[PDB]
Amino acid sequence: GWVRPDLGDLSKVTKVKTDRPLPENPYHSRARPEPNPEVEGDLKPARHGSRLFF
Amino acid sequence: RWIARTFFDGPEKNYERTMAILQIEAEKAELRLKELEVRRLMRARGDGPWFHYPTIDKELIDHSPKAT
Numbered sequence A: 001g002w003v004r005p006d007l008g009d010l011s012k013v014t015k016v017k018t019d020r021p022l023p024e025n026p027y028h029s030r031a032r033p034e035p036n037p038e039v040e041g042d043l044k045p046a047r048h049g050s051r052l053f054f
Numbered sequence B: 001r002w003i004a005r006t007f008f009d010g011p012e013k014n015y016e017r018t019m020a021i022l023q024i025e026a027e028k029a030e031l032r033l034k035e036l037e038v039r040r041l042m043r044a045r046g047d048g049p050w051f052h053y054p055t056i057d058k059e060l061i062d063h064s065p066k067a068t
Helices: B019-042
Strands: none
């Protein structure tokens, strides 16, 4: 029974553990709607100012 | 005939021209009406990259804490 550590624990890993799989959605219900699509391609001047003049 | 040369543009000009000015004018009017139509939709529903209000954060923290 006699075993004393003179350093500590320092985060021990449990490789033998199986039990249940980790990814199973812990809190998330909705995936959230897809964001605005990113515009790919270089912009070209067509109208050259859509203001009152020029 | 002497007044027609070096003092007049001619009937060929401003007929081939002006229609070119109208062609730019038609593009300028239709796209401005399209801009008024796009801004009427993009402000009402957040679908495109126009009049979009800034969000809180994309990524802040994901590391394991000392939580209960």
